[PDB]
Amino acid sequence: MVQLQESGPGLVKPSQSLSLTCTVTGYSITSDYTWNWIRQFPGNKLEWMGYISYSGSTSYNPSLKSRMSITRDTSKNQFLLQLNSVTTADTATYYCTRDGPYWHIDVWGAGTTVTVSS
Amino acid sequence: DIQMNQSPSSLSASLGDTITITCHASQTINIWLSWYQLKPGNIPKLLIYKASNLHTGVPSRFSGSGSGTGFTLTISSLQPEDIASYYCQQGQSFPYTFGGGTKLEIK
Amino acid sequence: LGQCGLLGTITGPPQCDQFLEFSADLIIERREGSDVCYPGKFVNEEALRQILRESGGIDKESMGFTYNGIRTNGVTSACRRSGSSFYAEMKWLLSNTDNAAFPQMTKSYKNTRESPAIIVWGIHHSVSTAEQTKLYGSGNKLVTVGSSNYQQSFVPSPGARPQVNGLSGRIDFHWLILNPNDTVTFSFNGAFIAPDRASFLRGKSMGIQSGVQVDANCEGDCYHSGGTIISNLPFQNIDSRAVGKCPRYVKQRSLLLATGMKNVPELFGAIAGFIENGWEGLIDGW
Amino acid sequence: NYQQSFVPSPGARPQVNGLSGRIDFHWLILNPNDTVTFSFNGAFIAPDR
């Protein structure tokens, strides 16, 4: 039973950073699958951010090339999302997901809603 | 990049009817799709991977198939727990893109 | 194909997911083409490579099997896409309770088109009898594969082997052909690697092998491994495994053909005859 | 010049015009003075000439 749960603040001021994490229980984040974050635009429209591998390699969305980082924590079974230089558009719902193979995506987290306005 | 034009944007169905939804990858990806239901109000669920094999634990009522640049599921004999929104994902070439999303409606 | 080994398209390894259903008029295999990700090999495999160098592509279709009492997603740690996968086209019929039993199966498929299939199944050679109980159960194992023109009843070989990049046990894939309306039946009580899609053909192409680049601006038809020959001359000393519509390989390298008279500076006896020398002060006529 | 020890394949097949089970016939050659021996506990279709 692999469960993923986001957490973070309520209101974020523009031109600042955003730090969310996802806790993962039931499965080590170093056992061999990657780990994604996925937003939700207003209007029910999905988009891909990037992953961190079980070893710790990352790829990113090539229109979020220089403003995004994703790291992890092997101790309390977590990984942490970081994004900066934000505008009004980034009010979304962020979904920490466990990826599957190139076949698909398996495990979805429930999500949480962010708000970026001053 | 690759564009995923899931059409139509919404259509209306009663109880017991067979309906299709049809994604349209803009470039050859040839087998790689998966179908996700995520409704506003719950966690998402998995339905189909490899564009044919249904996920383990799904009720066997639901199916889909396809290859090339055209993919399609099949849902009939609807339920009260059937109403959601339905997304398709191309797994060929990075970055991941999803589709527009169809909204399930009672006529 | 690049890093795709031509007989892998029929099986789907991670290096060939972008070529599972291609279409070509000129296929090219590279020196680095690998056909597998688990350690294993094909059978009669130079012949099968000669069906496909002209087939112009492939077109799979499903086959529709369904299993119960039995898992289907045992995974290997070398066919890696993000993690532990298997081939795209095949599955892994493994036992449910890990040492209790395994029921005997029987499945079938009838070809229904105008074209012959290319259907390929798999037999799994366990590394021991200690890891053929863990994977499958007890008793002897036999995979019966019969059609109209075909009857084999293959059997595994539980033995220790050297390791190829981590794993000792092999997996062998054999292949048959169906004709229209014809039917195959697979039956087994262990160690079988079923197909899930059959495979059809398209048309007419040619195959080459090279080590130089794919070009697109140049017009030519004689394709060997060090490039392309283009000439109006009937003879070439360039290569003798040149495929296409080439000139013909000789062993000489120069063979000059005259196009003037005998050069006499200063059968009928006038050129080098009773007219002694040529003229160099004559520039219009001969 | 020959030693095989063949074995049957009890399995279900498609039907060719009524029957499912097949029968396969193999063939050898003898030389002068040479001798063949057939031995079996079932499922054999002997020659007679």
Author numbering:
A (entry chain B): 1 to 118
B (entry chain C): 1 to 107
C (entry chain A): 52 to 317, 328 to 347
D (entry chain A): 200 to 248
What does the study report here?
The hemagglutinin (HA) protein of the influenza virus is responsible for receptor engagement and is, therefore, one of the major targets for studying the virus-neutralizing mechanism and screening neutralizing antibodies (nAbs) against the virus. After binding to the host cell receptor and being internalized into the endosome, the HA protein of the influenza virus is cleaved into HA1 and HA2, which are covalently linked by a disulfide bond. Subsequently, it undergoes a low-pH-induced, irreversible conformational change that is required for viral entry through membrane fusion. We resolved the cryo-electron microscopy (cryo-EM) structures of H7N9 hemagglutinin (HA) alone and in complex with the nAb antigen-binding fragments (Fabs) and identified the HA head-located epitope for each nAb, thereby revealing the molecular basis and key residues that determine the differences in these nAbs in neutralizing H7N9 viruses.
In the HA-Fab complexes, the densities that are responsible for the HA trimer and the Fab of the nAbs are clearly defined, revealing that all the Fabs bind to the head domain of HA but target different sites. The 1H9 and 2D7 engaged sites are located on the side of the HA head and their Fabs point nearly horizontally from the side of each HA promoter, whereas C4H4 binds to a site on the top of HA and its Fabs extend obliquely upward from the HA head. The most parts of 1H9 and 2D7 Fab binding sites are overlapped and span the RBD and vestigial esterase domain (VED). The BSAs of the H and L chains of the 2D7 Fab are 367.8 Å2 and 359.0 Å2, respectively. The footprint of 2D7 consists of 14 amino acids. There are 10 shared amino acids between the epitope of 1H9 and 2D7. In the 2D7 Fab-HA complex, two additional hydrogen bonds are formed between the residues HA N133 and A149 and Fab Y55L and K56L, suggesting that 2D7 has a stronger binding affinity for HA than that of 1H9. The epitope of 2D7 has two more polar amino acids (negatively charged E81 and positively charged K152) and is, therefore, more polar than that of 1H9. We found a unique G144E mutation in the HA of SD001, which is likely responsible for its escape from neutralization. Glu is negatively charged and has a bulky side chain, which created a repulsive force and steric hindrance with Y34H of the 1H9 and 2D7 Fabs (interatomic distance <1 Å).
